[PDB]
Design a protein around this ligand. Structure first.
Ligand SMILES: Nc1ncnc2c1ncn2[C@@H]1O[C@@H]2COP(=O)(O)O[C@H]2[C@H]1O
Length: 214
């Protein structure tokens, strides 16, 4: 019997959409920073669950260990960043990843046309969009204590979708799946992945594990 599923389609805030287009349709050197950005956010989410749980231990019922996994997959050209942080609720997703204006956006987009490195992206608080340096399509699966597991997704172009996730239950945390663009498969190489972790994500304060298929 046929399953039904609710999809909600949202427009990105105008300047996000401008920023997203700028990321996708300009050449940038040094695109490797995208991974530093996503580890940072897991690091943030990880600090959050750690602190929130000192207030309330039961918040770790969804899992005690707080870590980041990196999962490259050469068959489907996805690199997946997994954390056991606080996760995002449906409203966390909609507000935080595209809906609500960010105050840095205009300044950063002026900083790029003046010729700053896309490295600067973190300090303007629009670092998540660096995913678009290397990915044609991003999926975010997220599970917060206070909420059901949701999937956000966007091929840029002005829009993203949210829906309840029907895939594997995660427990608590965030899964960012980068569907990588063809010319960017280097971020599937465990050599390359190790290189950039050690270069840029040195003193994130949670263990990081790379899983290599073979
Ligand atoms: N891995 C993650 N876990 C929890 N929340 C996240 C994650 N990635 C992004 N977010 C939310 O998306 C937001 C984007 O801007 P900020 O990094 O300031 O804050 C980020 C978080 O609020």
């Amino acid at each position: 019997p046929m399953e039904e599923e609710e999809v909600e389609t949202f427009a990105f805030q105008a300047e996000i959409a401008q920023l997203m287009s700028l990321i996708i349709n300009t050449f940038y050197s040094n695109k490797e920073i995208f991974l530093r950005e996503l580890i940072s956010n897991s690091s943030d989410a990880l600090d959050k669950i750690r602190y929130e749980s000192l207030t309330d231990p039961s918040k770790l019922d969804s899992g005690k260990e707080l870590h980041i996994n990196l999962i490259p997959n050469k068959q489907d050209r996805t690199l997946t960043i997994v954390d056991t942080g606080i996760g995002m609720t449906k409203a966390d997703l909609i507000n935080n990843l595209g809906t609500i204006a960010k105050s840095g956006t205009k300044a950063f987009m002026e900083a790029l046309q003046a010729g700053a490195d896309i490295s600067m992206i973190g300090q303007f608080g629009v670092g998540f969009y660096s995913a678009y340096l290397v990915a044609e399509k991003v999926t975010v699966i997220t599970k917060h204590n206070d909420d059901e597991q949701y999937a956000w997704e966007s091929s840029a172009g002005g829009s993203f979708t949210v829906r309840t996730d029907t895939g594997e239950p995660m427990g608590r945390g965030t899964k960012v799946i980068l569907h990588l663009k063809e010319d960017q498969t280097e971020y599937l190489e465990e050599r390359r992945i190790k290189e950039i972790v050690k270069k840029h994500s040195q003193f994130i304060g949670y263990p990081i594990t790379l899983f290599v298929e073979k």
